[PDB]
């Protein structure tokens, strides 16, 4: 028996976009703004970033006429921050175990952002392997390499297989600040430690069990996520969540 | 400002039992019983079976005083039936994305189920390898089997390394009826075409993608899991959600 409104608001505070979005866009009490807003957001939370630079000129009207960001980052970084806003949400909701299985995409695309800045021609050394399989160092295009830090990977005598762990190890023998490697050696270990197991096997897991298993936090995971994310390059609010600024927004229209 | 029974009744419709067990423990105005039924409902989601087998005698009061099943399984098909309705939530949330990965391992573990039935000494012929790494099969060991499946299945050379795709070839040998192998064989290929690359990649992705890269929705697959668990012994309503069921009863308390 609660309102329309009522239960937009629940909704908004657990982020239930699609929810959300069905309840106002089948009603005649909302705002045009709202439904749209609604729409964005829950085409957001199923990584549609397409949908935002599709329709960016009613975007930049609702920016203008609430004074209030909806897009912060050009396509390429705007896809690695909108999936990070998804994984806070995810977090937020304490969705542990979802929250870690998401963390294997965007590590890996950060890994490889990370790498580009410090080797730019790194698609050379690189094999494309068909979509399953995949892809390949190509060890003896490397060792021809003017780049010191793509001499260095070659020696140990590694495998071929471009995995997260591997991009994980290039990553160390490059100049980046020590911050950034110690994060990625965190989240390295992460992904063997809780997010591997969590593929073949059914257990119970939480977040008092990820902090003991790894000895941090869902919340420290994501917020070094985060500083590999804006360190690349790619604008994200650590401070002020996307989506409850803008859920506050949505609020401030229909209360 | 919704009132905590509408608050509550909204977050069990989308079954955010993590927000709803908070909301119901820092409140006044609800009884024990939905205390305690909505810390059941939350371990279930946290994949926690362990907390009802641990509380199964005041499970078994509520049971037969408010005449409901809380539990359905013993302990090894419990957890498998408790997996599923996590997927099912998770669908009806319309989180697809977090659905598809999701299935890798109920899928696993049903597909090494059903061998375990055709196959009793199956745990013969699989390594447990150390740490990280998948489990493989002893090729050289399955060949003195008596069982014809078995050696049918090592006839054919295939990868060491035991994937669902690996189990789901070894089904099709075996006695298993045909309707259970097409199940398999269909499931094969979301693996392949959806779940493997959603695993790994940052898409945009929802319902309607689905139904484009397979020609099928989100309850089909959801069904077939279903179908393949029942056929192995296990208890799963499929026309009354358990969520939905235990909701209902907690609404009713407060009502
Ligand atoms: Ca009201
Ligand atoms: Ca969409
Ligand atoms: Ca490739
Ligand atoms: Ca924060
Ligand atoms: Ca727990
Ligand atoms: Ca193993
Ligand atoms: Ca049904």
Redesign the interface.
Known sequence: ???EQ??L???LD?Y?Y??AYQIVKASQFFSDDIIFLLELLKERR?????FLFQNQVHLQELELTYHISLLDNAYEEE??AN?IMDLEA?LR??????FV??V???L??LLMRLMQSQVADINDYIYDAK??QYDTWKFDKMHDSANPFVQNFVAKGRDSKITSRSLADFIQLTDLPQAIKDNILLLRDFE?SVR?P?????????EEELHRTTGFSSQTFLEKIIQLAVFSGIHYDNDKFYFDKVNELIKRIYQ
């Open positions: 028996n609660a309102t009522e239960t608001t629940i909704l657990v239930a699609y929810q199923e990584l549609n970033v397409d896809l690695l999936y995810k909701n304490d969705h542990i175990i979802d299985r998401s294997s995409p965007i890996y695309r979509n399953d063997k591997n969590l593929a073949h096997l059914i257990k119970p897991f939480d």
